[PDB]
């Protein structure tokens, strides 16, 4: 069984991340945060949680909605960097593969910001400190891709993912950079699924396979619903943007690659059982966040598994989205939709 | 905790404590020793 060899190098990590799980805000703590009047009341009410004394040394009057999520994210990222420094062998590779997906978003953000002639220093902020890679600010030169890959991207770990990307030889606009980002993310999800299948042991293997399948399915549905808009894409040129894994791959990605209107997407998801309750709703991303949280809650029942390191990392990032949504309503007096946070724990 | 009485006094006094921690942190980078009055007698002791 799995507990025999797991705790030789991952027992301290397991115990620390389960203790990190225990600081997730339950449903009553969000109600107590919702009842706050001003933002100092939100600070006092968050001081009685496992965030406690993190907005110390700020002010009583320099407290802003942006600053709250900056500090609440920096806490999360220091915790991730603490767990990754205590890992070795296969867990270190697992956490580097978690990091690469943020590196891709930093790459697309830097290339997009270079085109619109703006400052390098303002693209270097708002640029997600977890996927850093020290040679990143060198991407602000030489606005075509062939002078990017041949100078700075071959040394990055994103270098194997630029295989399907060299069909243009010109400069870049907002459409081409999103095509490059979707192709990089396809190659990333397929390589990380292949790493999970061949090298992670079983109770974490099946959990990470269903979590990465959910990530691939959400990418596929959003690429299909962002391609029926004011554009014209050949249907075999769109099947190169959909990842080859998940539970809607071998049939429904054939139909999503050919959907011409909004009713072609509802017809493609009508056959899959876990979906087709999603396209008649309020928000569409509030189904994906809810289903991701029900998947992450189910991953905390497996006790000897490193999927927990995923399931914590996505849950805590949901939590920082909730607090901001409360802090955007207290600072702006918009209490009408304040109870639309997403809470499972 | 934000609805109890005597919470504005706590906010004022730990604003003062925040500023005193800033003073102690600013006594680093310029190595100046704290005074450390070792008369722990005029507050605690006999008579209570």
């Amino acid at each position: 069984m799995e507990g025999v060899y797991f705790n030789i190098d991952n027992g301290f990590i397991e115990g620390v991340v389960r203790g990190y799980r225990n600081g997730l805000l339950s449903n009553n703590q969000y109600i107590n945060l919702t009842q706050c009047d001003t933002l100092e009341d939100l600070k006092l009410q968050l001081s009685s949680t496992d965030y406690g004394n993190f907005l110390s040394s700020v002010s009583s009057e320099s407290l802003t909605t942006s600053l709250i999520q900056e500090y609440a994210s920096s806490k999360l990222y220091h915790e991730f960097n603490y767990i990754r420094d205590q890992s070795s062998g296969s867990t270190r590779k697992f956490m580097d593969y978690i990091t690469y997906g943020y590196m891709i978003d930093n790459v697309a953000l830097m290339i997009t910001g270079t085109i619109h002639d703006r400052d390098k220093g303002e693209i270097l902020q708002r640029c997600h400190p977890l996927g850093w890679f020290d040679t990143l600010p060198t991407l602000s030169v030489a606005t075509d891709l062939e002078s990017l890959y041949e100078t700075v991207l071959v040394d990055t770990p994103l270098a194997p993912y630029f295989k399907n990307c060299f069909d243009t030889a010109e400069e870049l606009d907002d459409m081409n950079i999103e095509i490059i980002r979707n192709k990089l993310y396809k190659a990333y999800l397929e390589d990380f699924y292949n790493f999970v299948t061949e090298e992670i042991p079983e109770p974490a293997k099946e959990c990470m396979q269903t979590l990465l399948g959910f990530e691939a399915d959400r990418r596929s549905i959003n690429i299909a619903l962002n391609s029926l808009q004011s554009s014209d894409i050949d249907p075999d040129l769109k099947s190169d943007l959909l990842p080859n894994i998940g539970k809607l791959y071998p049939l429904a990605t054939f139909h999503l690659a050919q959907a011409q209107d909004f009713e072609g997407v509802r017809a493609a998801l009508a056959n899959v059982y876990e979906y087709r309750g999603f396209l008649e709703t309020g928000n569409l991303e509030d189904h994906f966040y809810q289903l991701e949280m029900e998947l992450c809650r189910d991953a905390f029942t497996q006790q000897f598994a490193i999927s927990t390191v995923w399931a914590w990392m996505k849950s805590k990032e949901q939590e920082v989205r909730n607090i901001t949504w409360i802090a955007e309503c207290i600072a702006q007096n918009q209490r009408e939709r304040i109870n639309n946070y997403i809470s499972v724990y | 905790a934000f609805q109890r009485t005597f919470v504005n006094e706590i906010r004022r006094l730990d604003n003062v404590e925040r500023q005193y921690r800033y003073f102690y942190s600013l006594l680093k980078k310029h190595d100046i020793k704290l005074y450390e009055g070792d008369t722990d007698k005029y507050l605690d002791g006999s008579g209570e």
């Binding site: 004394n53 993190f54 040394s57 | 921690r21 102690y24 704290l34 605690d44």
Partner: peptide, 15 residues
């Protein structure tokens, strides 16, 4: 009760 607080055990204890 009251006790002596010793600021270095209170500056590192906060942040």
């Amino acid at each position: 009760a009251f006790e002596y607080k010793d600021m270095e055990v209170a500056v590192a204890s906060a942040s």
